[PDB]
Structures are given as structure tokens and as C-alpha cells.
Ligand binder design. Structure first.
Ligand SMILES: Nc1ncnc2c1ncn2[C@@H]1O[C@H](COP(=O)(O)OP(=O)(O)OP(=O)(O)O)[C@@H](O)[C@H]1O
Ligand SMILES: Nc1ncnc2c1ncn2[C@@H]1O[C@H](COP(=O)(O)OP(=O)(O)O)[C@@H](O)[C@H]1O
Lengths: 577, 600, 127
DNA sequence: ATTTTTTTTTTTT
């Protein structure tokens, strides 16, 4: 025992354990102590702390632990397994066996463009935006071997005398150490990665980054697309002095005390009955079908009676399967078409926020990702976007102005959901409850639309599987042409229109509306009542069943709900003749 | 060493006593300036060194490395003897006589050197070492050799951990680093000795001299010539595999696209008192391109493409556009040859490329480590932050090259999909092109999209135009043979080096915004022309028929610093559009003449 | 060591000078107060005043010393010095002639040898 | 054997 300084016991000698028992004040709740006892409500096997109680206790240890932190934390492992195991039993009647835990630390941040040898082996707060990282494989700490039969005591998370020798004379040097892993221990890993900030010249420079090391409990916690504050360690991996013209080496860090950002109102993504009153006692009003014809364009005029046909769209129809095979097309889609200038871009762009979707078109997902990664050259996939749309739907332009490769998967999803693969020798036959809104700047507008059928030069199929195709124009109406000539200076100027539609009776509140829907589309198996008009006009019946869930009713009739019929007469005049 | 006795004394004799320029020499204050700047890069000029002791030129380059260390130690011994205060938290610089590329040689190794180069694509940033700690395997006591050690071994069985530990251990801690990023060299296309071998060589920088370089851009260096630590030493092939390495001491700008005038300040007033009024559409324009006679149209034309790029985000929609866009159809025979020269010297950002045969397919992202031969290259779009791509013979390029360019005009950006990494590239840039037509050399008032065949979704993004059909006009041709002789008889307003002050200030200060001043007129140019200019060649009216006008009528007034506007300079710019737009339509054309001569 | 270590048949690690030292260990030393060269490299095809049936102007390879360097350009006629010498190879492919070594005999990875030709020069006259 | 590339053929309305 080296009782001069750097003393090897102090912490577990008495100090930190007992400070923790000094973490003990009146209200009889001032504790970092029964924290684990509420972890033992489940056996989470970890605990949280600060770095500003030790400051509230002393000014002596905070500059001390920073030298040997990753030593202190397994010192704390020892502290715990000595302490709580005292608490596993008052008097001699309880202990099955001990176990192991982790500790979580946490104040004020830093950046990355300032940190080097000067601040090495030092614990820091910084922030970026995550990119991607690995899964979880494996680790352990100890086991033993035939050759000596001693535990594989390792400090850090070389390779040895034989000791299969003392049988009289015989030696056996040169290392016959054959590990017996059934004797072993075990830990976790992820090996993480992130990119530095988006505000600190990532443009004229390139973004630098960090490599990381997860341990026990902290994987399955973090997916990229996030923004975090963390602590780590400033360490490297190689040893030294035609690479390295003299001595060059590589950067990384560790994991310690992540604390993430959960910024406010994004996260009904990852992580009341009064609101149900708001749902229903508003739903009792029979004023929602055509009321919201001034809603989905909270800043635009037009599409009014076509917003009348969105009212059925997202609510969906019904996948009324049968005793025999089918799972027919409950899902429903739309088509729109016309020239630029009608703001149909912004119509889809602003719609992004209004359940799950993406808005890109042509040459810039698609199909599968049957490629490799870095890690022992695996081949593992990413799927399609029926993957990413199975109740979520999409709004996507430029069918025609996109590669002709990824067009067998259009009929292989809109008609049947008859999806399949053959890249490697197999049919991953995934499926999904998908639907789509379509837009285009296709050939020659209303001069083409009203008359016959020549829009796409490969198929007439695109009028069959969809129904509601209402034209986009830049019609000349001189009374409104000047308005739309000055419907574009208020848009062009002054940055005012954030929530101008908020005052409206019930044609706003994005969150409540999305939740309106995402309850509504999970009520029951609604239907209708007893009650060129050909087979795919009729196969509109989806909209018939829709008004059950639009009035949030079970049932409805044909011709009160032929509102849809009278709205479809907008489309049928395009391709009646 | 012995002579270093004198050197330190001779240094300390000048860094705070030798003075020019009427006292208080900077060095007495430079130290503390950088000290309060947390910067640590004390700079020197060899001129003043030479003024002190010209003996400082020839005991130096027996080893220029000792000069810099001997200077760094005077620094340390001056810093904390006076500022022991901030001792708990150096290198120096010199920056003056030029030597040339391919003149450093066999003989110019490791001496006093002053040398130049240019940048291109290279690697990221990384750290290096200084210090020897390895031991702890037997006893592993604290031993502590007394230096940070670069390439030094003793390896005893006796070393103070009970003079033991012939075997070995290694540390991964308590370990100094120093960032570093690699270069790529280039040499100028101005100072060409006619197509000799293209310059690229191993050259180096260091931690503080880092994170500043950019491709195809230049920076003058002090520099000193050395070689790689070991260039392929074994009884081997009929040549050694040798390269040679240069390393940076001070980096000194060659470009200065920013403010360029250091301690010109006498002529600076002539810019804003002569390029500020609405007459400057004649003053600044008389000198617009006074080279040859024809086509004063293009003088007015090209003067305003040079001018802008902006956020001014409208209401909550997105970023809308910040770019310029030009294109012409001519015939070689036209005087269209010099298509990119001068205002790109005005341009703070831009990069050149002639036509297909030499057009960029780069216009492809992975991420690697660096073993031997690891590089990748592609499009210049980060570059050209309000810069230009300077081109002739554009019509041959690749549709997918045009994809980025259409996206640059559409969403101010490009959009990668289905790749390993999906990194991006933002497009705040400008474009110039000089293609040739289909079926010949020019097709008449018959349609223009098929006069030269670009495609549908691409050209709608493009903005500026100038077109030359040209029949004969004689007096100017006799003037032009007179111009031939007298221009071949060089027997041997805004000031010329200050016009750039206009790109600095004009676009900078006044950025007017307006309500609809009379812009229901453009409701007419919508609707009337949807009924007037109907079927001759007569589609082309869009939002960019006016959004382009915001792009450039504003430039036309921004020339003036008006700050508030009626229709005057706006439609004077649309006097380009009365001139530019008319060009694309059938000889039943004067629907524009009727419909705009009031807007003329 | 002001000796002649400039060979292709060269070794930086050598044995000793005065005492007995190792036979693999090495220092690295004064590459700074010393004497050097500079050179370049080309290829060249057969002449056109000489043109035979069948055969073609094959390519042949040279390094030349410094004061001749970069004083040339495509398209000239010469009377060089053609002092042909061989490769001191490092490894060979399809060089399956004798495979051997200067290895002592036996009593109480290796190297191989197959070369190819080159040329060299000392003097020029563009004609 | 793969990574970073380029043409010269292989076969054409
Ligand atoms: N109006 C004019 N003013 C002055 N010079 C003219 C005029 N018209 C014709 N020329 C002469 O005609 C010649 C045309 O050929 P030129 O060298 O311009 O081809 P080019 O335009 O450079 O081809 P490209 O632009 O595609 O590279 C010019 O050298 C120019 O001197
Ligand atoms: N009624 C309107 N209100 C606001 N902006 C409009 C209106 N009509 C047209 N616009 C303009 O149209 C532009 C967008 O056109 P866009 O939707 O991109 O065409 P496309 O959808 O074919 O790409 C916007 O910049 C906007 O200023």
C-alpha cells in the first residue's frame, strides 16, 4: 500500500462510498443513493451522477479524477458491488449473487477545432450531428486457459513462461496458451462516429470527426439524425517513430456521459382525453368535409373542391379481406398534372409537414441495397421505400423525368403490391400498405388533357389504377390574372406568414390533426349502407366507405356520399372523350 | 555549440531595441499583440533582419533549421520572462525575394529558401508526434528522458527502473500531438514556359498552418527544400523511387480575392462619385468593353450578369434563387472569341473550362483512408460561392451534368440519392457558355429552342441571352481594316484597378425591396401575351421572366445605390428584355414592339 | 563515410568501420554536406530513315544526366551515345532462366536473377 | 482480387 499520494485505495478505502453516504440530507430524499434501488425495480444496472457535487463537496478531487477517470469508474464499480451488496441483505438472509453496473455522468460545452495534446486525457462537452455507426458485437474482460488456469486479468478495455511444465524437468516455452472462452466474462460495443458542427466553417474546409467506443448499456439508444452533448476521452490507438513520414497518428475518443438534445416539438417521432374531447366534440360538427377546403393551402387559393377530395384520401378506405385469398387495394392514390407557375412544387413541399413522406423527384431513394460495408465485407440491405411507406404515403413528381430502370416497381406495387427481388438468387417478398400523390409537368397541359389519350408514350395504364386526376392550369382569367400577379408580391416580400391560418375554426393545428387522423384510421371496419360510370370509376367505393371515417361513422349511403362522384366529374371530363 | 553564444545575444539586441519608422518598433508590441490574440505566430521580414546584420545570411543556410529553433527559444525566453502571467496555456515566420518553379534543384536543399506554388484537391487534417515515452514492463518506474524526442533510441537493459527492462512496453497516454493536413501543388497558367511538365510536388505544412487551403487557389510560401525520410532504399530496380518534400514556414497569400490594398488609398473616391448615378449606364458603360466596334448590345448585356447572388428569403417558402445565367448562339466568324477574360478578374470566385473534348465530367463522393494512391475528384460547386464557370462550346455536355445545374437554378442546391454517403453541395454560383447551333450557324426568327437544341427542363432555368444574325454594314468594315493596321500598329470614368471596388460596395450596401410598383403590368405581360403573343414563337413568359428581372433589374439599379425604386431603372433593365426577348420569335414579332414600346 | 554508396547494388545497412558492430543495423547520416545529381527519363521509338519490312519502331528507355535535362522536345534528330547497360533488378516476372545465388556450400526469401536491357547517353546534337 | 480510372474495339438506324 503506497500511502504517500496517488494512494491506490482512498476511494474504496472510505471516501467516495462514504461521500455518497454523505449525499444524504433532510427531506430524506436528497440521494444519489436509492437511485439504484429504483434501478432494481427492473435491474437496469446503472446509475446517474453530476460533476458538480464534488465541487459542492470539495475543490480537491475535481482536478484529481481527470487524470485517472477510467480508473475511478471501475473503482466505482467496485464501490457499488461492495455497497449495494451490503444492501442486498440487512441481516444474513439475502444474496443470490452479485453483478455489475454502469455509471452515467450528467453543464457547459466546447468545440472540436481547439483540442489536442494540451487537453489530452480530459473530459469535455461538445456537440455535433450524428451520421451512422455499427451494431453491437462482442467483448469480454476475463476467462482462463488450460496452460496455467488463471483468470485472464486484463487492465484495459501483452500475450504472456508456459506453465504446462512442472512435471519433473519438462518445460514447454513459446506460449501454448489456448483460450477457454466458456470460462469467460462479457461486455458490449457499438463503435460510434459523428460529424462536427454545421456552423463552424464546414464549407470552405471539410468536416472533421471522431471515432468512439460504447460499453454496456448505451447502444440501442442513438440513431443518426440527432444532436448531442457528450463526454469522452482524448486517446489514440497506434504506436511509433512509408506512412508516418516521421510519426503520424489517428484520432478517436470514448463514450462517457452522453446527454442528448430532444429539441422540443420534433419528437413525436422517436420518443390526452381532453384532446379526445377536442377530437370528438369538434367531430360532432358536420362541417369538416368541405370546411377544410381552405385548410391544406393555408396561404394559397385554388384546389378548393379538390381539397374536398383530400378529405377522404389520408383517412383511407378499407382492406376488407375475405375468407378466400385476397388482400385487395384498400389504399387509394391521386394524380395531378399541369405546367409550372401554379406553385404545385410548394403544394407538395408545404404538404411534407402535413404523416410520413419525402419530396424529391428524378436523378436524386428509388429497390434494395445489396452492397457491402467495411466490416468483414458483409453484404446487408436497406430495403425499398414500401419499407418506409406502410401506412405512410408519398407525394412525388416527375414520373416521366426519371430513369426507366425503376419503373417495373411501379406496376409491382400500385396494382397488386406484387413485390419481389432476384438480385442475389432470392425473392425478398416484402409488402406494404402504401399509396401516393402524384404531380407532373407533363406534355401540353389542358390542350392535351380534355381531348384524347396521348400523355405518356408507353402505357395507357396510368388512367386505370387511379381516379382523381384534376388539371393544373395557369388559366388566363383577367379578373384574377392581376390578383395572381399581386398574389406574388405578398409572397415575395416581408416574411410574415408563419401561422396566419391559426385563427381558423378547425382547419389548422398540425399536431392535433395528424393525431386526429392517426386515431381515426384505427376505429373499426366501417362500410356504407344498402345504397363513363364503368368498373374503375366504381372500384370511388373506397371514398364511399371513407365518409364513414370522415364523419367518423360506421355507415353511410351512396348518393349523399356521391359528393365524390360530383367531384370526380372534374376528372372524367378530361378523358371521357 | 559555441557560436549560438553570440546569436541569442544578437537577437535580444534587436527584438526590442532596433527600430525604424520613428520609434516603437512592432516587435516590442507584436509579441503582446499575438499574446493577447492567443495566436503564437510572431513574424519577421528578412529585410529588417538584413538591416540589422547582413551576417545573417551565410552562417544560416549551413542549417536553416537551427535558425528557427534559435529564434523560437529567444521567443520563449522573452515571453515568460516578461509574461510569466500567461505561461500556463511558439513558432515564428518570415515574409522577400523570389525564386521560380523548376529552379530549385539538386543544390537547393535545406537552406534559406523563398518559393511559390498553387493549390488543388488534397486530403484532410491529422495529428503527428514529438515526445519519447515508452517504458513499463518489469519495474516500470518513472524514468523520464530529458527531451521530447524525434527518432531516438538507446535501448539498454540498464535504464533507471531498477536499470532493467531490456524487454519493452509502450504507452498510449500522456502523448503530445500536432494537427496536420496534406497539400497538392499546382503552378500558374500565367507564368508558363510553354507547356513544360506540370508542377506537382511533395510539399508540407503543419498544425497552425492548416485548415486554410482551397483547390485551384494560390498562396506564396517561404518554404525550404528537403526529401522524403526514406525513398525506397534496397538493392533494387534501375532507379530509386525518390520524390522530394517541401515544408511550410510562412504562408503568404497570392490570391487576395478580398481587400487587396495593404499599407490604392489615393484613388478610391472616383468609384462611388462616378459609378453611382443613373448616367453610369453611360459612364460605367462607355468603358464597358471598348475593344472593337460591333454589338453595343452585349456591352450592356454582360455588364449586369457579373453582379449578384442573394438570400432575401420571401415569406416562409424556401430560399428562392441567388444565381446568374447566360448563353448565346453565334458562328465562328462572329467576334465572340474572348469569352471570359476580364470580369473574372473582377470575380472573387470563378474557375475556367473550355468545351467538350475538354469539358468537365467532374462538374462522386466516397471517403477513404490514405495508403499509396488514394484520391478522388469531382465538381467545383463549393468553389464559386458567387462565382462562374467559364466555357465555350457548351451544347455537347452531359445531361447529368445539366442535372446539377438545373438543381442549382431550381432549389439552390443539388440532391444525391441512393449512394453510400449522401453528402451534398450547395450552389451559389454563375454560368457562361458559347455554343454553336444545329443545322449550321444560325437559324432565323424561326424558333430558338430548336435554333440550337437544348432540352425542356434545363433552359427554363437559364437567364441571359445575346444573339447575332449579321448582314453587311460597310463603313465599319473600312474602319475595321483601319483598325487592323492601326491596332497592328502598336509598334513597340472609373479607374482601372478600382472598378472592383464597385463589386465590393454596389452589391453590398443597397439591396432594395419593393411592393408592386406597377407590376400588374406583368399581369398584362402574362395575360395579354397569353392572348396577344399567342402562336408565332410565343410561349415564353413565366415567373422567371420576372424573377430573372429581380435578378438583374435590381443589379441595374444596384449599380446606382438607389435603395428605393419606381419603375425607371427596372424597366431600363427590361429594355434589355424588350431587346433580349424579341430575339426568339417569328417575324410576326412586333407584338412585342406594340406591347412594350411604352415599356421601352 | 565519403565512400561510393550510390549504386543500385546498394545497402544502407553495413557491418562496421573500425570495431565489431552488427551486420543488420544502420545509422542515417550526412545527406546534407555532400554531392548529388539530377536526371529525367523518356521513351524513344525507332528512326524513319531506317525502316525495315515487317518490324516496327519499338520503344527503348533511358535516363540522362542533368545538363542535358529538359533541353529537348518532341521531333528531333540526333547522334547520341548509345552506351547500353542492364537492369540491376529487384524482382522478375517470367525470368525463369537460372534461378540461383552466390551461396556458400554445405557441410557439417532468397533472390533470383533475370534482367533486361536499356540504354544511356552522354552527348547530343539535334540535327 | 477488390479500391481510382479511358479508350479501343465489339458491333449499329
Ligand atoms: N463585328 C466584328 N468586329 C470585329 N471583328 C469581327 C467582326 N465580325 C467578324 N470579325 C472577325 O471575324 C473573326 C471570326 O472568327 P473567330 O476567331 O471569332 O472564331 P471564334 O468566334 O473564336 O469561334 P468560337 O467563338 O466558337 O471559339 C474574328 O477574328 C474577328 O476578327
Ligand atoms: N398564387 C400564388 N401565390 C404565391 N406564389 C405563387 C402563386 N402562383 C405562383 N407563385 C409562384 O410560383 C413559384 C413556384 O413555381 P413551382 O411550384 O416551382 O412550379 P413547378 O411546381 O412546376 O416547379 C413560387 O416562387 C411562387 O412565387
Amino acid at each position: 500500500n503506497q500511502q504517500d499520494a496517488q494512494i491506490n485505495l482512498q476511494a474504496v478505502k472510505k471516501k467516495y462510498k462514504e461521500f455518497i453516504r454523505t449525499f444524504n440530507e433532510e427531506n430524506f430524499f436528497y440521494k444519489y443513493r436509492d437511485t439504484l434501488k429504483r434501478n432494481y425495480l427492473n435491474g437496469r444496472y446503472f446509475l446517474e451522477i453530476e460533476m458538480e457535487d464534488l465541487v459542492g463537496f470539495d475543490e480537491t478531487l475535481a482536478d484529481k479524477l481527470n487524470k485517472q477517470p477510467t480508473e475511478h469508474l471501475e473503482i466505482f464499480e467496485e464501490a457499488a458491488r461492495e455497497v449495494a451488496d451490503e444492501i442486498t441483505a440487512p441481516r444474513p438472509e439475502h444474496e443470490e449473487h452479485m453483478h455489475d453496473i454502469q455509471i452515467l455522468l450528467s453543464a457547459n460545452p466546447t468545440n472540436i477545432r481547439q483540442l489536442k495534446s494540451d487537453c489530452v486525457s480530459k473530459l469535455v462537452k461538445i456537440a455535433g450531428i450524428i451520421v451512422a455507426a455499427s451494431g453491437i458485437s462482442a467483448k469480454a474482460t476475463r476467462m482462463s486457459i488450460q496452460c496455467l488456469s488463471c483468470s485472464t486479468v486484463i487492465p484495459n478495455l501483452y500475450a504472456l513462461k508456459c506453465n504446462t511444465e512442472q512435471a519433473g524437468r519438462p518445460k514447454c516455452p513459446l506460449d501454448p496458451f489456448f483460450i477457454m472462452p466458456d470460462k469467460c466474462k462479457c461486455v458490449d460495443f457499438q463503435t460510434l462516429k459523428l460529424q462536427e458542427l454545421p456552423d463552424f466553417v464546414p464549407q470552405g474546409e471539410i468536416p472533421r470527426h471522431l471515432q468512439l467506443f460504447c460499453d454496456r448499456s448505451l447502444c440501442e439508444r442513438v440513431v443518426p439524425g440527432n444532436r448531442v452533448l457528450i463526454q469522452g476521452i482524448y486517446s489514440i490507438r497506434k504506436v511509433g517513430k512509408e506512412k508516418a513520414v516521421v510519426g503520424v497518428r489517428a484520432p478517436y475518443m470514448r463514450v462517457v456521459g452522453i446527454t442528448v438534445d430532444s429539441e422540443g416539438a420534433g419528437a413525436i417521432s422517436r420518443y390526452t382525453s381532453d384532446e379526445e374531447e377536442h377530437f370528438r366534440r369538434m367531430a360532432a360538427s358536420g362541417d369538416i368535409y368541405e370546411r377544410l377546403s381552405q385548410s391544406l393551402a393555408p396561404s394559397i387559393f385554388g384546389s378548393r373542391d379538390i381539397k374536398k377530395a383530400i378529405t377522404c384520401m389520408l383517412f383511407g378506405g378499407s382492406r376488407k379481406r375475405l375468407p378466400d385469398g385476397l388482400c385487395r387495394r384498400g389504399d387509394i392514390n391521386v394524380l395531378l398534372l399541369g405546367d409550372p407557375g401554379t406553385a404545385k412544387s410548394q403544394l407538395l413541399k408545404f404538404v411534407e409537414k402535413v404523416p410520413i413522406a419525402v419530396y424529391t423527384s428524378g436523378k436524386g431513394s428509388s429497390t434494395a441495397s445489396v452492397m457491402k460495408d467495411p466490416q468483414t465485407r458483409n453484404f446487408v440491405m436497406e430495403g425499398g421505400a414500401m419499407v418506409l411507406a406502410d401506412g405512410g404515403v408519398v407525394c412525388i413528381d416527375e414520373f416521366d423525368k426519371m430513369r426507366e430502370d425503376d419503373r417495373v416497381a411501379i406496376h409491382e406495387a400500385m396494382e397488386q403490391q406484387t413485390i419481389s427481388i432476384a438480385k442475389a438468387g432470392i425473392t425478398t417478398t416484402l409488402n406494404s400498405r402504401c399509396s401516393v400523390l402524384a404531380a407532373a409537368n407533363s406534355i401540353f397541359g389542358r390542350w392535351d388533357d380534355t381531348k384524347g389519350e396521348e400523355n405518356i408514350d408507353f402505357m395507357p395504364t396510368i388512367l386505370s389504377r387511379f381516379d382523381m386526376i384534376f388539371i393544373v392550369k395557369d388559366i388566363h382569367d383577367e379578373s384574377r390574372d392581376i390578383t395572381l400577379a399581386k398574389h406574388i408580391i405578398n409572397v415575395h416580400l416581408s416574411s410574415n406568414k408563419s401561422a396566419p391560418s391559426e385563427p381558423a375554426e378547425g382547419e389548422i393545428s398540425l399536431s392535433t390533426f395528424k393525431k386526429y387522423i392517426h386515431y381515426c384510421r384505427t376505429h373499426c371496419g366501417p362500410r356504407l349502407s344498402e345504397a363513363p360510370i364503368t368498373v374503375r370509376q366504381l372500384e370511388v367505393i373506397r371514398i364511399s366507405e371513407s365518409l364513414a371515417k370522415i364523419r367518423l361513422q360506421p355507415f353511410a349511403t351512396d348518393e349523399h356520399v356521391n359528393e365524390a362522384l360530383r367531384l370526380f366529374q372534374v376528372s372524367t371530363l378530361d378523358a371521357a372523350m | 555549440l559555441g557560436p549560438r553564444t553570440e546569436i541569442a545575444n544578437r537577437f535580444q539586441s534587436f527584438l526590442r531595441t532596433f527600430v525604424d519608422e520613428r520609434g516603437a518598433y512592432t516587435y516590442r508590441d507584436r509579441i503582446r499583440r499575438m499574446c493577447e490574440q492567443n495566436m503564437s505566430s510572431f513574424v519577421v521580414s528578412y529585410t529588417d533582419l538584413a538591416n540589422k546584420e547582413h551576417v545573417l545570411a551565410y552562417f544560416l543556410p549551413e542549417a536553416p533549421f537551427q535558425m528557427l529553433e534559435i529564434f523560437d527559444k529567444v521567443a520563449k525566453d522573452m515571453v515568460l520572462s516578461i509574461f510569466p502571467t500567461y505561461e500556463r496555456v511558439i513558432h515564428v515566420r518570415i515574409s522577400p525575394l523570389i525564386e521560380e518553379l523548376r529552379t530549385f534543384r539538386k543544390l537547393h536543399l535545406n537552406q534559406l529558401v523563398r518559393t511559390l506554388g498553387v493549390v488543388t484537391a488534397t486530403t484532410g487534417v491529422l495529428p503527428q508526434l514529438s515526445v519519447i515515452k515508452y517504458d513499463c514492463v518489469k519495474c516500470g518506474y518513472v524514468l523520464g528522458p530529458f527531451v521530447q524526442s524525434q527518432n531516438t533510441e538507446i535501448k539498454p537493459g540498464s535504464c533507471p527502473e531498477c536499470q532493467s527492462t531490456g524487454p519493452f512496453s509502450i504507452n498510449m497516454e500522456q502523448t503530445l500531438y500536432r494537427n496536420y493536413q496534406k497539400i497538392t501543388l499546382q503552378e500558374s497558367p500565367g507564368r508558363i514556359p510553354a507547356g513544360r511538365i506540370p508542377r506537382s510536388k511533395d510539399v508540407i505544412l503543419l498544425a497552425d498552418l492548416c485548415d486554410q487551403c482551397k483547390p485551384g487557389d494560390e498562396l506564396e510560401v517561404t518554404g525550404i527544400y528537403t526529401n522524403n525520410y526514406d525513398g525506397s532504399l534496397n538493392t533494387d530496380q534501375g532507379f530509386p523511387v525518390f520524390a522530394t518534400v517541401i515544408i511550410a514556414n510562412h504562408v503568404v497569400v497570392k490570391d487576395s480575392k478580398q481587400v487587396v490594398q495593404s499599407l490604392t488609398d489615393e484613388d478610391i473616391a472616383t468609384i462611388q462619385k462616378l459609378s453611382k448615378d443613373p448616367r453610369i449606364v453611360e459612364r460605367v458603360v462607355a468603358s464597358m468593353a471598348p475593344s472593337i466596334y460591333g454589338h453595343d448590345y452585349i456591352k450592356r448585356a454582360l455588364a449586369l450578369a457579373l453582379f449578384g447572388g442573394e438570400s432575401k428569403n420571401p415569406g416562409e417558402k424556401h430560399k428562392v434563387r441567388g444565381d446568374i445565367n447566360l448563353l448565346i448562339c453565334g458562328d465562328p466568324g462572329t467576334a465572340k472569341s474572348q469569352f471570359l477574360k476580364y470580369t473574372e478578374k473582377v470575380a472573387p470566385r470563378a474557375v475556367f473550362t473550355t468545351g467538350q473534348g475538354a469539358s468537365a465530367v467532374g462538374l462522386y463522393v466516397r471517403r477513404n483512408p490514405v495508403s499509396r494512391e488514394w484520391t478522388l475528384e469531382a465538381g467545383a460547386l463549393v468553389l464559386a460561392d458567387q462565382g462562374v464557370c467559364l466555357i465555350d462550346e457548351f451544347d455537347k455536355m452531359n445531361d447529368q451534368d445539366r442535372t446539377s445545374i438545373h438543381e442549382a437554378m431550381e432549389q439552390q442546391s443539388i440532391s444525391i440519392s441512393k449512394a453510400g454517403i449522401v453528402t451534398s453541395l450547395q450552389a451559389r454560383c454563375t454560368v457562361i457558355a458559347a455554343a454553336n447551333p444545329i443545322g449550321g450557324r444560325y437559324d432565323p426568327s424561326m424558333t430558338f429552342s430548336e435554333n440550337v437544341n437544348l432540352s425542356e427542363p434545363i433552359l427554363s432555368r437559364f437567364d441571359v441571352l445575346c444573339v447575332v444574325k449579321d448582314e453587311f454594314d460597310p463603313m465599319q468594315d473600312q474602319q475595321l481594316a483601319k483598325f487592323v493596321v492601326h491596332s497592328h500598329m502598336k509598334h513597340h470614368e472609373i479607374p482601372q484597378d478600382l472598378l472592383r471596388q464597385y463589386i465590393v460596395y454596389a452589391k453590398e450596401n443597397i439591396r432594395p425591396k419593393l411592393t408592386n410598383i406597377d407590376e400588374d403590368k406583368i399581369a398584362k405581360m402574362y395575360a395579354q401575351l397569353r392572348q396577344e403573343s399567342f402562336a408565332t414563337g410565343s410561349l415564353p413568359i413565366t415567373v422567371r421572366h420576372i424573377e430573372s428581372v429581380i435578378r438583374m433589374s435590381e443589379a441595374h439599379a444596384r449599380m446606382h445605390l438607389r435603395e428605393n425604386v419606381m419603375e425607371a431603372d427596372v424597366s431600363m433593365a427590361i429594355r434589355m428584355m424588350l431587346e433580349s426577348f424579341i430575339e426568339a420569335q417569328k417575324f410576326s414579332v412586333m407584338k412585342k414592339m406594340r406591347s412594350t414600346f411604352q415599356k421601352y | 563515410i565519403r565512400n561510393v554508396e550510390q549504386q543500385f547494388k546498394f545497402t544502407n545497412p553495413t557491418i562496421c568501420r573500425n570495431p565489431v558492430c552488427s551486420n543488420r543495423k544502420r545509422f542515417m547520416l550526412d545527406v546534407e554536406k555532400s554531392l548529388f545529381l539530377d536526371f529525367q527519363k523518356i521513351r524513344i521509338q525507332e528512326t524513319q530513315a531506317e525502316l525495315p519490312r515487317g518490324c516496327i519502331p519499338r520503344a527503348v528507355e533511358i535516363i540522362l544526366r542533368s545538363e542535358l535535362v529538359e533541353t529537348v522536345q518532341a521531333g528531333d534528330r540526333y547522334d547520341f551515345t548509345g552506351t547500353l547497360i542492364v537492369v540491376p533488378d529487384v524482382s522478375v516476372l517470367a525470368g525463369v532462366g537460372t534461378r540461383a545465388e552466390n551461396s556458400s556450400r554445405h557441410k557439417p526469401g532468397m533472390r533470383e536473377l533475370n534482367y533486361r536491357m536499356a540504354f544511356l547517353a552522354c552527348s547530343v546534337q539535334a540535327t
